[PDB]
Structures are given as C-alpha cells and as structure tokens.
Design a protein around this nucleic acid. Structure first.
Ligand SMILES: [Zn+2]
Ligand SMILES: [Zn+2]
Ligand SMILES: [Zn+2]
Ligand SMILES: [Zn+2]
Ligand SMILES: [Zn+2]
Lengths: 154, 303, 379, 379, 379
DNA sequence: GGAGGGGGGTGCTCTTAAAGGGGCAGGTCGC
DNA sequence: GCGACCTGCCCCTTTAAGAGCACCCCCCTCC
C-alpha cells in the first residue's frame, strides 16, 4: 500500500524542509505551524511547556521511573528502545563513528564532539545560538541545544 | 678490501653452468618467471638474473655449491661467498638486499638451517681458528649501519650481543626498551666531557641480593670517535628517533618489525609488532658467525 | 584553454546547442551498466593458471601485480619491472580541454596507486564520433589533444604515439607505462589490522556530472528541483570537473614517505566495489570497514531523490579520475592528511580518513548508517 | 573450441540469425571514413615541440620510433629503449575465436615492423556491446578472450591486464610493450636507392570480408554475382580470415638476417597509405614505386563492380592485420622470399616483391598501370 | 549419520514423495490442542494425598520435589535420591537421525533443568506407524535408533532397553534416570526478588517446523510466501533442527557454578505456561515478568501473519527440546551468558536474559509489547 | 465498491546536555 | 627527604531526553 514517492517542499518561510510524500506535507503543516498550542506538564514542579500533544506522553516517561527495556547481556533497565540500542554497542564491541583527521573511533556522537575540540573545528562553524554563542555547525543542532539547555519553560 | 665480489661471481657462475647442464640434459620444459615466454635458466651473470631466479638460485647454492677440490664449502666460507655476491650486486646497480628483502625470505631460511648447528673448529694446530667472516666485512657490504631499517635493526643486535654478551636468543628476547637506560653521567673532572652510554643489567642468578658491584653486573657501551658511522650510541639514538612514539616506554620487546615501505625522508621506519622468534633466531645465527663477536664471546664466557 | 573559465561554443564559432556530452549516452549506472558481469570479464582477462608454476617453490611474487590493477611484469635484463596501465573514459564534461586532461589523469591514476611517481611514456586513443559534423571535429579534437598533452607534461611524461579510430561515441584514453626498480613502487598486499583508510578525492563526481546534464531538460530537472537548486549544482559541477583533473603524484610521494601498505584508485565500479577488490589481495586476513563518505555539497540529497539511479550511500556509484584509497597506520595517516592539505611543494588539497582495517574475513563493507561529510564548496 | 574448424551458433544455444559482425556499421572505408583528417590528428598527437630539443646538439634518434608507429623511448636504466604499439579494431569476421587471434595479430604487427621479435607484456581492451543479449555475452565474449590469449601464447607473451568498456560497437585491441637493447630493433630510415619492397601477405582482405558480409542480403549481392561467382567468396573469405591470424614473427626474424633497411605494417591506411608514411621518414632522398599488387583471389575484379567503396587499384584499400613491407636490397630479396617460403621448421608463406626503390622526392606512388597477381588459395 | 549431508530418501532406497513427517497430524498448537486440560490431567496423576504425612512435624523436601517435573523420590539406601523423567514427541523433522537425536535431547532436558549433569540409564519407546510400509520400516527405524544412541553417548549414558509398540503415528521418546547425592541437583524452589531469568535456546521452533512443511501444500504456501522467502525458511529450519538436537549439559553444569535458584524447560506449553508452572513452586512470593523473547530469524513475522495459530508474542507457542529458563542473580547472569558463549571446553552457544523477578503472588506474565530479538543463523 | 482525505498515535535516527567513573595533580600528616 | 592519605579538577564515556519524519492504524468519505 506504499504510494509512489514524490517530494514537496513547505513553501512557508523559515521551513525549507522537503518531505518524502505529499501525504506528509499536510501532517507537517498542521502539527508544526498551523497548530499553535501550549500545554503544561502535570508534574507539580516541571514547569515545562509543550505545544504538541505527542511530546507530553514522552515527557511523562521522564518524570516517572518505569523501565520496560532490559538488555540481553547485563540485564540493565532502560526507559527507551534507542537508549538500549546504544547500550548494546558496549557488549558487541563496535565503534561506528570515526574522526576524519586522526582516525579516532568512538561509539556515540557525544564522544566525537569532545574529540573535535582537539582538532579545533568550531572556527569553520558558522551557526550559533543567540543566548550563549555555542558555535554549532548545522542548524537543527541549535534547536537541540535550545531544547536540552536554555529550555523553554514557565 | 676485505670482501671480494669476484669470488662470489665465480662461484655463482660455476653453479649456474652446472645447473644449466643438468637442466638441458634433463630436457624438461620449465618456464621462467619473466614476462616474455622463455625456458627457465639461471643466468651465468648475476646482474641479469630476475628477482625470483636469484632467490631460487641462491637457495640451492646452500646445498650444491662446490669448490675446485669438490668438497662442500664450510658454513663460514659459504656465508662469506654470499656476502661477496651481495657486494657484487651493490657494485653493479642492483638494489636488492638478499638478506633482508621480503622477496628473499626463503634464502634466509635455508641459510639459517645450514648455519644452525655450526661450531668453531679447533682443527688447526692453533687453538683458535680465525673465521673468514669479519666485522669489517659486514660493514663494507652495507649489512651494518643506518642504510635501511633492517640493517639498522641488525646493527643493534650486533652491538647488543658484543657488549652485553647476549649470546643466547633468549637473552636478547628478554631485552626490552624500558630495561635499557641511557645516562650521560658527565664527569666534572673533564669539562664538557659529554660521556654517554647505555647500561643493561645482566641475567646473573645468585643467592645474594642487592647490587654487589656496579660494573660487574652491568655492561656499558662506549662512543667510537674513530668513525661516527659506527658509534653504538649514535645508532641507538637514531634507532629511537625512527620508531613510533607509542612504543617508547614499553617493557615487552626492544626490536620492532621493519616497515615494508620506507623513504629517505620518512619520519618512521618501524612498526609496533615485535619481530618473530623465528626471525630473531635467523638473525642471531648469522651474527655469531662473525670472528670479532665469536672471539669476544669466547673470552667472556671463559673468564 | 585552462585560463578561460569555461568552453563557450559561440567563441569557437560552433552552434550554441552543441554539447560534447551529447555524443555519449549517459546512463545512471555509468559506463559500467553490468557490474558483476564486467567484473567477471575483467577477472577473466587477468585469469591465468600457468603462472603458478608450482608457486616457483615458494612465495613467488605475482606477475599479475595487484591482480585487478597496474600489473607488474618482471624483465629479463636489468632486474627491473615494467608497470603499465590502461583506462578509457567517454566524454562526461562539456569543456573538451578539461575532458582531455581528465582522461590523462584517469589513465595515470592507476600508476599512482602503486607509488610510481614518475612515468616514462604515454599513448593516446582518440575516438572520433561518426555523428559529428566535419567542421566540429576540427575545433574540438585539437583541444582534447592539447589537454591530454598538457596533463602529460604536468605528470613528467610526454604523450608519443597512439591511435585514432572512429566510434559512435567519442572514446578517450591511453596507456601509461614505467620501467622502474623494485623499490620504486608499493605492492598492495601488506595491510594489517589496526590500520586506517585514507581517501584523497571526494566521492559523488558521477552525480554532479550527470545532474548538470539535467539542468536543460525540464522533465528530469523537475524531479530534483526541490532538493537541490541550480547555482549549487553548477558549483558542484565546477568542483568535480576541477577535482577530476588533478593528479595523484603528491599522493604517491606521501605514500612512499608515510609507510603506506596498500592503495587503489576509485575509478569505475564504486568505492565499495574497489574496496572489495583491494581486500582480496591482502596476504593477511584483514577486512575493511568504511565509516565515512566524503561527498560533494548537495550530492547525497540528489542521490536520495534519484532513487536507485545513483546509490552513493551503498558505495556502488561509478567514479571517474577518483582518488586513492590508501591503508596507513593511525599516526602516519594523521600526519598524511596534514602534509597533503598544506604542503610547501605544491597546492593544498584535503584528504579524509574513512575506515578502519578489521581482521578476519578479507571482505569490505560499509556500516549500515555511514556518516556523510559534506565537502565544503572550496570555501 | 580451438580445434573447431568454424563457428556454429546452434552449437552454443544461439539462434542461427546471430552474426558477430552485425554489431558494426561496416563502411567501405572501414574503421575511418577520412584518412586526411585522421592522419592529421595522429600527426598532431605524435608531435611535441619540446621533444626536438635542438636535436640535443647532435644526431638524436627519433623518439617516435618509426615516426608514425611503434615509438621508441629511451630509458634511464642501461640505455634500454621502450618500444610499444597500440591498435584497436572492430569485428569483421563472424568467427569469435578467430576474431581474437586477428585482434592480437593486429596489435603485434606494428611491433614486428620495427624488427622486434619478442614481447614482454600485452594488455587488451574488450568492448562489449550494449546491444548484445545477456545470454550471448556470457558465451561469446569468452571465445574472444580465449582466442586472444592463445594468440598471445603464439607470440611468446602473456596477457596480464586490460580494461572492459561498453560501446555500441564491439571494440577489440591492446598494447604490446617490449624493452629491448639498441641491437634488437631496426629504425626504418636507412633506405637507399636500388632496393626492392617486399610484401609478406596478400593484399585485399577487406574486399573479401565486406563482400562475404553482403552475401546474405540479396539487394547488393545481385550485382556482385555478375562479376564473380558466389563460391569464390567462401574460399576467399577463409583465406582472408587465415591470413589475418598468422603473425609476422617469422618475417621479423628474417629482417635481421637480411639487412632490412626499413619496414612497416600494412593496416588501416592501405598499401599506398603506409608507403608514403614509410617514405617520409627516410633520411636519404628516395621514393617507392609499387610495380605489382598481389591482390587476393578475384578480389581485384570484385573491386571493379563497386566504383569507390573499395578502391583497391589506387591502393587505398583498408587492410586488417596485413603483412609487412620490407625494403631489402635486390640481392637479399631473392633469398628472403625463398627463405620465408620454405623455413627449416615449416609453415612457410609466399612473399611478393611489389616494387622497387628510386632516388628522388620523399614520396610513394603506384604506377599508372599496376599489374595484379592473384594469389593461389591453399586447400 | 545424517549430519554430514541432508537426508535424501533415494539414497536409502526411498521414493522422492516420502517424508517422515507424513506420519503425524501436525498442528500449530502442538501435540496438545487443549493445553489447559492436559495440565489438569498431569496435575491429577502427579497429585498424591498421602505424601503430606502430617508434614512429618517439620519442613522437608517433597517426594514431588516441585510438583510438576523431575520427581526426586528419596530412596532408602545411603539417603540418595532418584530423579527420573519421561517425555514423548511425534516426529517433526524429515531426517530420522536428527529426529532421534532430538527425542533423546528432549528426554534428557528435564534432568538438566534440575542441575543433574549425569544419567545412569535411559530407556527408549519406539513406535512404528501402521501406514508405513515394510520397506520403509527397516530403512528409517535403524537410523532413528542410531541417532538416539549417538545422542545418549554424548550425554554419558547408554540406552539399555525399552519397548516397541504399534501406533497410528510414530511415537518417539524415552525415560532418563539418575541416582544422585542430595548435593548434586538444584531443587527449583528458591527465588528472590532481583533475580533475572535466562534462556539458553531461541523460541519459535514450532513455527519453523510448520512452515517447512508448508512448502509442499500450495494452498498454505501462497498465504505465507509473501512475508518470507524460501531461503529464509530453509535456514530457519536448519537452525531449529540443530538447536532442537542439542544437549543442555553445559547449561546444567554452569547452573551450579553461578548459584542458580530455580530452572525449568520450555518443552511444551510455551514459555508462558512453563513460567507460570514454575512460579507456583517458589516458596517466596515472587512473580516473573518477561520483557524479551528471542525468536528465530523471520519466524515472528510468520507467527503474526498466520493469525491466532502460534502467538509467540503471547508466549503460548509450543516448543520441542527447548532451552532452560534459569533464575540467577543479576551479576551471575551477566557472567553466565559470557561463559556459555565461549566455554573452556569449547562449542559455545548464546544465551539471553529474557526477564526479571519481582515481588508478586506466584504468577508469570509477559509485557504488552515484548522486544522480539531476531537471533541470526550463526554459522 | 472504492482510492483518497482526516485524525490519531508511534518507532527510529539524529542531536545535545547531564551524570559519572577514572585518572592526574594539589596539600597535610607521618616516618 | 620520602612516602601515604584525602581531596579537587579535568577527561572521556555512557545514560537520559527532545525534535522531527516516515509510518501505520482506524475511520470517514462522497463519487
Ligand atoms: Zn513547514
Ligand atoms: Zn514534565
Ligand atoms: Zn547491557
Ligand atoms: Zn581527530
Ligand atoms: Zn546556548
């Protein structure tokens, strides 16, 4: 039932994203731009704000302590499947990423970001967040920084 | 000089003539390793011989090389003849090193087997027999020095086994870079003396503990002002300068396998994988044949 | 000419619609429409049994050389080895001078894969198109010849001799030969575990070349009008054309300097196809793994848009005049890129470490989710 | 398949309608429609101003070898000279295996024209047509490769490389390289007045091949039947096929024995096409005259039917894997032809003294009223 | 032996149409459609009212050591114990040799659940189908018996008796007995919160068996041919046959090493039923929860496609010669899987931690969305 | 009957920040 | 003078959590 692939771009300014199908364009527009909403996490002290309704359900996982994912080898409990997937790399002993200058291999991009400091590369990076001038390379990284740090809360 | 290439050329020519006669009388088709289609034959001249033909030709000489009397050569004179062959190759433009090049590995194996169970001969009325192979012989033939990674690695073995008197293979193998130490120990008596030497503890198993005597338990090298090309301290310093930085500070092995590819302006010559035991023994078997080292170890152990 | 920014047909008094690439029929799979079949045919050409000769009673050196590239043939006299290669590339660029230079560079690249810095002689095959007006042939072939000769001059050799034949598609190529001593070249069979792979030129040249052809056709352009604009496509075309016309002489020099074990040229097939070819030659049990993939700017997205036509991610995209895939230890590779990037001898050019030499299998592979390093547009 | 006397498409699970020559647009001119333009282009690619170098203040031997073919390149080591040739052609014979032998013989023909008898290496180019059916390719191409390797074996050489490309027309060829001392090749510039030119193979293979291809279609065959009988083609076709698969190696050896002042290969441009080229490089003021053209059986009459498509009489009839043209002295020629006719080992063949040599302008010419000799086919 | 090559009926003078599995009415629910009722019957035959004996004014192990399997039955002499088990499975694999090995392994698996690594004697029940012809009986039964004896040999025991009876379906099974000291077997009644369950064999063997028998019925295959290719079914069937024909001697031996509290086997009733039976036995108030479900590659897709036939995600699919569900502490379990993968004795196999143990009411459940682990067909 | 739209909920790949264990490097007390 | 012990700070790796797209599932639909 997979429809043929076509590419359509959100003509709205500030969103140059191109989507895999015309189907997804309606969902993108509605859930991102047109649907302007604000919610508050029910937790007494969270004080966070999420415009989508999907995000809150994920956020509820953070405040609770329900761990439904168990590693095959060490029987350790995780809150999300992808966290487990990253954990399994320890047991299989695989290091996918690799620095392109000194050939230094790591397991996660967080390690690589640390290594890039040795091979000083922020000089050629152009993007940066307005608050604390983080000096990122790409754009969505600034959004991730604004999410984890400089959080939007009440 | 000490080493004569004409003798090696003559021996190779005689063997090649005999082998060609054998092949032609057998009249069995056999194809050369060259690009053009031709029946395999061992050139009566060394230089024209292909890379593979020299290896196979050189391997069989260890078993078929004859003399005018017809008696097989003794191991020492045979090694001398091979050194003469190498000198001849160097003189006429060939750059191959029959003792170190990877394409000549089998020749080294056969030579090691020939020289494995050799012993000095007291057959002459004199109680000491002077081996034909000499220190100046290897120096002239570019076996020893800083020319190539393999020759330098062999040079360290030559000086290590002469001064530290590590005749046994195990004594060398137990050696490690951490154990070897270099101390200037500059003497104020002579201004700007700049004395330098490397010391190594000797494996003398005695009940008593502690350092009884500094000199008795240790062997120290010394600078050679007669030629800077021969100073063991200089070669050792140059050895470390051409080794990976990671290995320095390691106590596992001292000798590192040469890199198969090197250039005159290459910062590094050696890998991080220590030479194999078989290669260590093959290198040692050849070094002991030298006359200077032989008499030096004969005096040391006796005393 | 080199100085002129581009070849303008009007200036040479040719029809404006004239395009050199018109004569060829470009395909998504490149000139290598069959991959396995052409690979088997190439193996059959080099397939030889009598050369074993009882292995010459030992670990005899292979007359085939790499087996798949730059065969080395020992000579009867002098103890020398003849090292020659051949490669033919159809026109894929609109500037005949640059295309001839690209053909010469592609022909010479195979020698540089074995550290043969200097070349002795080069031959030239100059195919002439049947469907080419007599007047056009007199304005393009001189330019292609001049580019070939200039590239040969830049490589320290002179193009003497050759052959000229008529074919429906223009065929450009030649033979580069060198009579060198054993220490002059590097036999690619010494790879050991723990090494790293270095790429001297970015991937994705084929995509950049092909897309520039779509810039005029409105049917094909609309399929990617959203992913990639036109000015960036033109920039990628310029950079790929300039990249394909360099020479790997500096790569060979640093290869000798920095204790390289094995190397190969990424020409045709793909990076993965050539990596698999290289892995088979290794004496040890070493399997390559490629983690990164340098691709020209805005070329991975075009590959995604075009579906199975290109397939950059899987590494099966064909390349022309591609870089070297060296196998150096970690520290040497780290120093390798620094020296090549900013050398005193010549102009600077980047190099990336893309993989790690793993042990056991004698196979090549790309991780399921390789990282894409968008090469900056020479800024 | 070597022992098989002919090609049986039904024996390889192929429909009888399959013809190997079907994949090429065989024109009367053969490979190249023009000779003036092709000659000019070849001269352009064989010309380099920096090559002259004021003759190095002396009598430097040409670096282009013959000047037009089989370039000789001095080497750095031991005064050796690198002599290599390249030549590519398209299928003209239905038999696959015999086509490979013809292709191999064509490449080495240039090499044997310089006196070189033994070769070191020989790359090859396998152009597999995109129109070819997949099933046929897996069975037809191996026949060509095997035949080419067998011819290389006959030549005392091994094929240890090559390249495969896609091309509307099957393209076959290769490059042969020989590194030889100065006393192993003959520079063709010592011709002196009072000599005779010797052609070692019968002229007119292209006529037979083309007419045999026309055999099937009746539109053109109707008029050819008037001038010659059909049964002549079958034996003439076989003779042309076989004369294009025998190497000139024996003839090369006899040049050394018989003071061959110069030699060339008759291929592509025709007997008069190469007569002028061979003359232009002679350092002595000489001219060649062809008093006899030993045409193949009845092919001369067949050429009369088509006014210009073949043009044998004027001598500009393309030939493939043709014989040599040796300018021996008058006395030597007598024994040379006899020696090649009855060798000690055997397998002799006839050689014809096409003409003589006279002093004058550096040009070639076929007399206004040439005589024709109809070589007797062997059966 | 049939381990060297797959069982071919013709090799043993059997027709192509012959298949051993034809002698059983295979069904997706296993050899027991009303699993719940058979549990009641087994409880009825096990339960004995006199064994309580007023508790003997103390707390001592019961005759039915756990009330579900491997009764201990203490003896008189030397205070020893008599652990004895029985099991019967109808043929599920075409190969008779491997089928006999599977039956022996299933018979022995019950003892290994209690930690007993040695068997003094074993009996065999061999049933010959009525429908089987005489020519088949003397060709298949010897293979079955040879496989059974070979499996017994690997277990350090000997089959030294049994019984043979006629049956509509082939019935293959045995009975294993061991007389052991009180310290040689782990009584599976201990379990404390914080422990982690461990499985030694992947699930979904019944699905692989059923699918392999659907490759001959056109009606069934078309329903499932969409989701899985034939090669996947072949490799899954091979893996299941190899797994089902494997002894748990190593797991039983390691159980003592790593302080195992309780264990069982997954033969029949699925993973959930056996866990539920095990949970009731525990003295403490502990309930099991299973988060991971290792399944043979691609079998889960078939399981969900077929509908309410297997329900692996519900832990109800029956299994034959299944693994051990061992309850170990966290760090011991972490070490347990490491050692079983690469034992000192060699020939290791992977194991998984499929769940946790928590305070409850002596019950076992499976999370709503188990994380299906696709075990690859290693070697 | 139906393929297309609307509404909803979800897994997966990527990214970043926070937490944490290991190890290098001080200051203080004892011998 | 030399060492052991406590503690502080940095390095590098692993876990935790948000963003958004591609996807499926269900339902409805008027043509
Ligand atoms: Zn948008
Ligand atoms: Zn919250
Ligand atoms: Zn884990
Ligand atoms: Zn780095
Ligand atoms: Zn910030």
């Amino acid at each position: 039932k997979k429809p043929p692939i076509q590419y359509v771009r959100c003509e709205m300014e500030g969103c140059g994203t191109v989507l895999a199908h015309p189907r997804y364009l309606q969902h993108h527009i509605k859930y991102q731009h047109l649907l302007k909403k604000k919610y508050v996490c029910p937790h007494p002290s969270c004080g966070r704000l999420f415009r989508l309704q999907k995000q809150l359900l994920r956020h509820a996982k953070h405040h609770t302590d329900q761990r439904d994912y168990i590693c095959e080898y060490c029987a350790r409990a995780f809150k999300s499947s992808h966290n487990l997937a990253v954990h399994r790399m320890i047991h299989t002993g695989e290091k996918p990423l690799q620095c392109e200058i000194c050939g230094f291999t790591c397991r996660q991009k967080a390690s690589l970001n640390w290594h890039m400091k040795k091979h000083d590369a922020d000089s050629f990076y152009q993007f940066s967040c307005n608050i604390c001038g983080k000096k990122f390379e790409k754009k969505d990284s600034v959004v991730a920084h604004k999410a984890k740090s400089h959080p939007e809360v009440l | 000089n000490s080493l004569k290439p004409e003798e090696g050329l003559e021996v190779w020519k005689n063997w090649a003539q005999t082998k060609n006669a054998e092949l032609e009388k057998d009249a069995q088709n056999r194809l050369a390793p060259i690009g053009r289609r031709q029946l395999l034959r061992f050139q009566e001249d060394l230089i024209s011989s292909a890379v593979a033909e020299l290896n196979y030709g050189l391997c069989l000489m260890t078993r078929e090389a004859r003399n005018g009397e017809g008696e097989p050569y003794d191991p020492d004179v045979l090694y001398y003849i091979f050194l003469c062959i190498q000198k001849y190759l160097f003189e006429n433009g060939r750059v191959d090193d029959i003792f170190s090049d990877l394409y000549y590995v089998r020749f080294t194996e056969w030579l090691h087997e020939v020289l494995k169970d050799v012993q000095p001969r007291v057959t002459p009325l004199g109680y000491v027999l002077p081996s034909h192979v000499t220190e100046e012989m290897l120096w002239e033939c570019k076996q020893l020095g800083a020319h190539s990674p393999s020759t330098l690695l062999t040079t360290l073995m030559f000086f290590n086994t002469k001064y530290f008197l590590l005749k046994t293979v195990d004594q060398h193998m137990k050696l490690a870079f951490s154990k070897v130490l270099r101390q200037t120990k500059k003497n104020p008596s002579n201004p700007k003396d700049k004395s330098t030497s490397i010391r190594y503890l000797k494996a003398l198993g005695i009940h008593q503990t502690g350092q009884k005597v500094t000199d008795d338990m240790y062997a120290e090298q010394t600078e050679n002002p007669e030629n800077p090309l021969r100073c063991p301290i200089k070669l050792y310093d140059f050895y470390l300068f051409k080794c990976p930085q990671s290995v320095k500070g390691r106590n596992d092995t001292f000798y590192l396998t040469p890199e198969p590819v090197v250039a005159p302006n290459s910062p590094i010559w050696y890998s991080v994988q220590p030479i194999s035991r078989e290669q260590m023994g093959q290198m040692l078997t050849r070094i002991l044949v030298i006359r200077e080292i032989q008499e030096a170890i004969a005096v040391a152990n006796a005393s | 000419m080199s100085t002129r920014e581009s070849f303008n047909p009007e200036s040479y008094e040719l029809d404006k619609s004239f395009r050199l690439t018109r004569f060829t029929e470009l395909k998504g799979t490149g000139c290598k429409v069959p991959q396995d079949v052409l690979q088997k045919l190439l193996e059959s050409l080099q397939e030889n049994h009598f050369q074993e000769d009882e292995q010459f009673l030992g670990a005899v050196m292979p007359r085939l050389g790499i087996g798949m590239d730059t065969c080395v043939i020992p000579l009867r006299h002098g103890g020398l080895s003849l090292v020659q290669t051949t490669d033919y590339i159809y026109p894929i660029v609109d500037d005949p001078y640059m295309m001839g230079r690209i053909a010469c560079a592609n022909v010479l690249s195979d020698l540089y894969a074995m550290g043969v810095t200097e070349c002795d002689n080069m031959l030239m095959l100059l195919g002439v198109s049947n469907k080419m007006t007599d007047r056009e042939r007199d304005k393009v072939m001189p330019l292609i010849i001049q580019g070939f000769k200039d590239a040969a001059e830049e490589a320290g050799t002179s193009v003497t001799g050759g052959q000229t034949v008529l074919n429906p598609w223009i065929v450009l190529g030649g033979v580069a030969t060198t009579v060198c001593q054993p220490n002059e070249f590097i036999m690619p069979d010494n790879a050991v575990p723990g090494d790293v792979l270095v790429l001297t030129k970015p991937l994705g040249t084929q995509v950049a070349v092909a897309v520039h052809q779509w810039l005029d056709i409105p049917e094909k352009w609309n399929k990617i009008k959203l992913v990639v604009t036109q000015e960036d496509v033109e920039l990628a075309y310029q950079e790929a054309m300039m990249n394909m016309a360099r020479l790997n002489r500096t790569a060979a020099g640093l290869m000798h300097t920095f204790n390289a074990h094995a190397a190969t040229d990424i020409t045709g097939f793909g990076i993965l196809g050539h990596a698999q070819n290289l892995a088979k030659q290794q004496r040890n049990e070493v399997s390559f793994v490629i983690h990164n993939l340098p691709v020209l700017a805005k070329m991975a997205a075009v590959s995604k848009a075009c579906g199975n036509m290109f397939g950059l991610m899987h590494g099966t995209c064909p390349e022309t005049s591609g870089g070297l895939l060296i196998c150096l230890p970690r520290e040497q590779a780290a120093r390798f890129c620094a020296e090549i990037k900013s050398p005193k001898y010549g102009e600077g050019h980047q190099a990336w470490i893309i993989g790690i030499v793993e042990k056991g299998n004698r196979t090549a592979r790309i991780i399921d989710k390789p990282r894409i390093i968008e090469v900056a547009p020479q800024v």
